[PDB]
Amino acid sequence: RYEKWEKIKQHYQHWSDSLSEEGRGLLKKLQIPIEPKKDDIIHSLSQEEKELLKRIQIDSSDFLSTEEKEFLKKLQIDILSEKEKEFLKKLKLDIQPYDINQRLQDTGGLIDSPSINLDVRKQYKRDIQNIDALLHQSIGSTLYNKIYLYENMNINNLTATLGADLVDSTDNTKINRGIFNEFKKNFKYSISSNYMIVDINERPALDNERLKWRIQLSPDTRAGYLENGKLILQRNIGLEIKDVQIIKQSEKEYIRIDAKVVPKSKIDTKIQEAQLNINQEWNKALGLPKYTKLITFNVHNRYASNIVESAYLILNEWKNNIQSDLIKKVTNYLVDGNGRFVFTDITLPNIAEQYTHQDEIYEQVHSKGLYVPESRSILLHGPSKGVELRNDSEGFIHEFGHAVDDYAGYLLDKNQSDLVTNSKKFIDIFKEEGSNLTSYGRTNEAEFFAEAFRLMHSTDHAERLKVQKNAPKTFQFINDQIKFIINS
Ligand SMILES: [Zn+2]
Numbered sequence: 001r002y003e004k005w006e007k008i009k010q011h012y013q014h015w016s017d018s019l020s021e022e023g024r025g026l027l028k029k030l031q032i033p034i035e036p037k038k039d040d041i042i043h044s045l046s047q048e049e050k051e052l053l054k055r056i057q058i059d060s061s062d063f064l065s066t067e068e069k070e071f072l073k074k075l076q077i078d079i080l081s082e083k084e085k086e087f088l089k090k091l092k093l094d095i096q097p098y099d100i101n102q103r104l105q106d107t108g109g110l111i112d113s114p115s116i117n118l119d120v121r122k123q124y125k126r127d128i129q130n131i132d133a134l135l136h137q138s139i140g141s142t143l144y145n146k147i148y149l150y151e152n153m154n155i156n157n158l159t160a161t162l163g164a165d166l167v168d169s170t171d172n173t174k175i176n177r178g179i180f181n182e183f184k185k186n187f188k189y190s191i192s193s194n195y196m197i198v199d200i201n202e203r204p205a206l207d208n209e210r211l212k213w214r215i216q217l218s219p220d221t222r223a224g225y226l227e228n229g230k231l232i233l234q235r236n237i238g239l240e241i242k243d244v245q246i247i248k249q250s251e252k253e254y255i256r257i258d259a260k261v262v263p264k265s266k267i268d269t270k271i272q273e274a275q276l277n278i279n280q281e282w283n284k285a286l287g288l289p290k291y292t293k294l295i296t297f298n299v300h301n302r303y304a305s306n307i308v309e310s311a312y313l314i315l316n317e318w319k320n321n322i323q324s325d326l327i328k329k330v331t332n333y334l335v336d337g338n339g340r341f342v343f344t345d346i347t348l349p350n351i352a353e354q355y356t357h358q359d360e361i362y363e364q365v366h367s368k369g370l371y372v373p374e375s376r377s378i379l380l381h382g383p384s385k386g387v388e389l390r391n392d393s394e395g396f397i398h399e400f401g402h403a404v405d406d407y408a409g410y411l412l413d414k415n416q417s418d419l420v421t422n423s424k425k426f427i428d429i430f431k432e433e434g435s436n437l438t439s440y441g442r443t444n445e446a447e448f449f450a451e452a453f454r455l456m457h458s459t460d461h462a463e464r465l466k467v468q469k470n471a472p473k474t475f476q477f478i479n480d481q482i483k484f485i486i487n488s
Contacts, residue, residue, distance in 0.1 A: 004147050005200045005229050012225035015137050023134050026127060027226065031197060033099035038071075041095055042078050052087060054079035062443075063088065063365075071095060089362040093117070100127055104194035108300025108346035109236060115349040115364060128235075131195065134224060135234045141219035149231055150202040151213035155255075158211075158303035159183075160385035161392060166210065173252040175210070180246060180255070186309035189267050190239035190259060193300045200229045205254060212247070212254050215239070218261040238267040241305075267304065271297050274308050282315060286328055294335060298344035298351060307382040310392060311343040314380065317393035318400065321457045325486040330400070333407045339376030345383050353377040369395040371402030373419070378403065388438055394454060401453030405446060408481040421445040426477060433471035452478060 009016075019027075045053065054076050059069055061080065072095070093116070103124045107113045111125050139147075155163035162183055168176050198215060205212065217223070222234035239259040247256045275297040283292050295315075299307050319327065334340075340353055348354055349364035357374035358364050368386030370379040378399045380392065389395045408420035420426060422445070430445045441451040452474050455467050468475045 001201050008143065008147065008200055008231070009225055011140065011143060012137065012223075016225055019134075023130070026130055026134070027224070027232065029098075029127070030100050030131065030195065030232070031226070033097040033102070035097045036071075036095045038075055038078065042075055044094070049087075050079065052081075052084055056081045056084045061088065063092065068092060068095070093361060098123075100124060100131075101194040101197075104128065104235060105301060106347045107193075107350045108298070108344075109193040110300075110346070110350060113350040114355055114359075114361075115347075116361060132234070135195075135222045135232065137222060137224070138219060139217045139221050139223055144217045144219045144221070147200075147217070148202075149198040149200060149215045149217060151196065151198045151215065152203060152205055152209040153211040153213060153302075154208050155183075155211055156208075157383075159306065159383060161389075164385065175246055175253045175255065177246075183255075184244040186306055187241050187244055187257075187303070188305040189241055189270065190302045191264060191267060191300055191304045192233070192237050192239070192302065193235060195235050196233040196237075197226065198231050198233060200231060205249070205252075210254050211257060212249075213257045213259060216258075216260045221261050236264050238262045238264040239302075271299050271304070271308060278312065278315075285319070286331055288332070288335060292335060294331070294339070294341055296340050296342045296344075296353075298342055298346060301345040301383070303345065303383060307343055307345050310382055311341075311380075314343075314393045314396050315341075317459075318396060321397065321459065322400070323482070323486070326404070326482055329485050329488075330403055330407050333410070334376045334378075334403060337376040340378070342377055342379045344379065344381055348379050348381055351379050354379060368392070369399045371399045371406070373402075373406055376403070376406070388440055394458075397457050398450050398454040401450035402446065404453060404481065404485070405449050407485055411484065419446060420481060421449045429473050429477055433474045436470040437467065437474075448474070449478070 042050075056076075057080055058064065058073050058076055061069065062085075064072065072091075098120075103111065107115070111121070111128060114121070116124075155166050162179055166176060166179050166183070168174050198213075202212065202214070217233075221237065224232045226232050238261070240262050241257065242260055243256070243258040245256040245258075247254055275295065279293060279295050280290075282295065283290060288294070295311065297308060297311070342351055342353055344351060347366045348370055349361070349366055353375040354370065354372050354377075355364060357372060366381070368381055368384055368389060371377070372379070378396065380396055380399070382392065386395050389398075405419050405421050409418045409422065412418070412420065412423065421430075426449065427445055430448050434445075434448050435442050437448065437455060438451045441448045452467055452471065455463050456475070456478060458464050
């Protein structure tokens with residue numbers, strides 16, 4: 001336990017001793033993000049703004065992250081709501097901690113992405129570059145194969161959908177074995193785009209970490225010793241999943257993920273190869289040009305290979321549950337406008353198909369999926385879970401729902417290009433039936449249309465018919481639009 005710790009510490013002793021006080025300080029900033037002083041913020045608001053705060057329906061919002069909704073309610077006592085909505089969007093940017101590792105993960109390493117304030121984006125960049133320069137020493141071709149490094153990870157870091165049910169509610173010290181097989185089904189490779197911080201000695205799991213990574217470095221892998229038995233690894237490395245098993249540790253159940261370090265490029269190629277292949281296959285199915293670029297894989301993080309394989313099922317479910325003609329027509333419209341199906345594990349404000357059309361950061365959105373009319377693209381973010389969605393496949397259909405809206409209004413006026421949900425016919429339909437479907441459907445016309453579209457294509461046919469009953473005017477309006485599109 002302490003031998004191999006001592007052997008690593010020595011190997012890195014010259015390196016450690018050589019650390020500037022400024023560099024030693026940087027590695028601390030990295031491990032411990034600089035949270036916002038709760039006081040430092042409230043002393044920025046105006047007297048008018050203070051009012052709107054202490055009395056807004058906070059703990060139950062649309063965009064309010066759990067870490068955000070808590071940190072925020074932590075301030076309402078230092079003293080929905082639609083004009084508090086545009087207020088919140090702005091306030092959400094001024095309270096994010098300064099968390100380098102998070103910045104790398106959100107952006108997939110594309111730190112230049114215009115998704116935060118320029119001067120803060122530059123700070124991150126200065127720090128990330130400094131750390132790269134700090135981490136110059138390989139593990140060396142002697143230690144790499146005689147030691148194991150360990151990481152404990154929360155399952156929700158990799159897929160929030162499948163992590164909600166990875167533990168039996170039956171028995172919470174055992175793992176549901178079905179969800180295991182499809183977690184491990186297509187888990188072949190991984191990508192760290194930030195700095196992995198790993199233990200020299202396997203550490204006992206804490207509250208919600210049921211994944212116990214056991215990792216084997218390569219001779220070239222660059223790393224640095226951190227006090228108390230840890231290593232910090234250079235970012236941008238690839239991991240080949242070598243064995244995913246269920247092990248037992250002190251009469252609870254865990255997942256052993258065995259991984260080897262390999263060049264990020266080896267995986268990037270694999271992803272590139274896959275992205276080619278899936279366009280090949282779906283260009284044929286849609287009768288689009290052999291070489292058309294419709295599907296994009298934007299993949300940079302730890303459940304890499306699954307994002308890829310997931311996209312195949314999502315696209316299969318799309319073809320199974322939606323008339324062939326509706327699909328072919330609408331996709332041809334998206335490609336007519338250089339559109340994209342984008343499957344990704346970086347957050348959505350860091351997807352170019354979104355950020356180049358929304359300059360203001362306070363109006364950039366992250367969530368399970370998105371449609372961007374200005375770039376005619378569907379963005380689907382693998383790792384998270386949308387509220388009220390069974391699987392990632394359903395969320396897609398919701399977004400295609402948005403593109404169906406798009407084509408329908410283009411076809412009303414090729415000149416006055418607009419959304420059908422902005423035609424007064426559907427606007428009126430919404431004020432009646434707008435509250436009869438999903439709770440989220442009540443948000444606005446467009447979303448109501450999308451959710452209705454979604455439900456109207458469930459594999460659960462009870463749900464399909466519940467739309468005809470509770471919102472028959474919405475139902476007919478949609479199927480109309482469909483019939484409309486199929487006729488060129
Ligand atoms: Zn939507």
